Design a protein around this ligand. Structure first.
Ligand SMILES: COc1cc(-c2ccc(O)cc2)cc2cnc(N)nc12
Length: 292
């Protein structure tokens, strides 16, 4: 009953984001028309083709299956009559994306706080891995802020389920891809694994410690290293050669050595040498303990 939401009772309040092949809106589920209803986050498809609806239903089943303090909560689904368009209903995290939150407050969020968020992201990712899910799009823009003390992973739109007999998922015909967060084997062979999510986690750690300084973003820095003259497919070709030759994002200004060492270990060309999320959460919590 409460996981079944009638669309006619969903009142549009504001736009929240436009990520993959859809959009997220803040709505009030108000079946009493007195504006006393619950505020929820609603994901819908901008282009709801057969293929997109099929992938969106898998995203919904993925989100529904996850129950963790650092993963956005699934609330329900709204079904349309006839062609069966879908809306994913989720909890609304009022402080918005971690990217926007950090870009707004900057260094007013101290290192202790950044490491609390880092630990929460590792814990959400470690739990995701126990379900054999590969996020593929871990970035601060896809992490949401519930309050000053808690962040949660969102946007499971690129998430893949590992085959039963394989430790990677190969994407045959990729769509829009966040190449500046991709592990080298994801760029070269379109192979995604827990280890490529660890590589992305290293990029998220870099984002946090740059405080989202625009000129320091992973796309701005990698484009600077390959040359700003590179365009389209040439960007991927030169990025692969850069990573193969140990070109990496620089240490963020004022980043503690112990944190930078974690980033560089996540960015290992050798897939098997990257740390596990279980170990990362242990390591980050010890650093937090030493700082406290
Ligand atoms: C883009 O902003 C958001 C995205 C999601 C979300 C989560 C899981 C998922 O598979 C797809 C989308 C949820 C959101 C919740 N509260 C706010 N502020 N924003 C949100």
């Amino acid at each position: 009953d409460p996981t079944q939401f009638e669309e006619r009772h969903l009142k549009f309040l504001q736009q929240l984001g436009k990520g993959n092949f859809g959009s997220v809106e803040m709505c009030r589920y108000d079946p009493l028309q007195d504006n006393t209803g619950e505020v929820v986050a609603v994901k819908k498809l901008q282009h709801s083709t057969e293929e997109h609806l099929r992938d969106f239903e898998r995203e919904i089943e993925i989100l529904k299956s996850l129950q963790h303090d650092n993963i956005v909560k699934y609330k329900g689904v709204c079904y349309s009559a006839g062609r069966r368009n879908l809306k994913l209903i989720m909890e609304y995290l009022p402080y918005g994306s971690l990217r926007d939150y950090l870009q707004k407050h900057k260094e007013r969020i101290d290192h202790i706080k950044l490491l609390q968020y880092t630990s929460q992201i590792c814990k959400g990712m470690e739990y995701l891995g126990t379900k054999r899910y590969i996020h593929r799009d871990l970035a601060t823009r896809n992490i949401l802020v519930e309050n000053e003390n808690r962040v949660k992973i969102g946007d499971f739109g690129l998430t893949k389920v590992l085959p039963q007999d394989k430790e990677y998922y190969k994407v045959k015909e990729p769509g829009e891809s966040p190449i500046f967060w991709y592990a080298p084997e994801s760029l070269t062979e379109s192979k995604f694994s827990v280890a490529s999510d660890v590589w992305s986690f290293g990029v998220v750690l870099y984002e946090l410690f740059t405080y989202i300084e625009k000129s320091k973003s992973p796309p701005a820095e990698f484009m600077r290293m390959i040359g700003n003259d590179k365009q389209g497919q040439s960007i991927v070709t030169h990025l692969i050669e850069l990573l193969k030759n140990n070109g990496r994002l620089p240490r963020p200004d004022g980043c503690p050595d112990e944190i930078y060492m974690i980033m560089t270990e996540c960015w290992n060309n050798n897939v098997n040498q990257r740390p596990s999320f279980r170990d990362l959460a242990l390591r980050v919590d010890q650093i937090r303990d030493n700082m406290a």
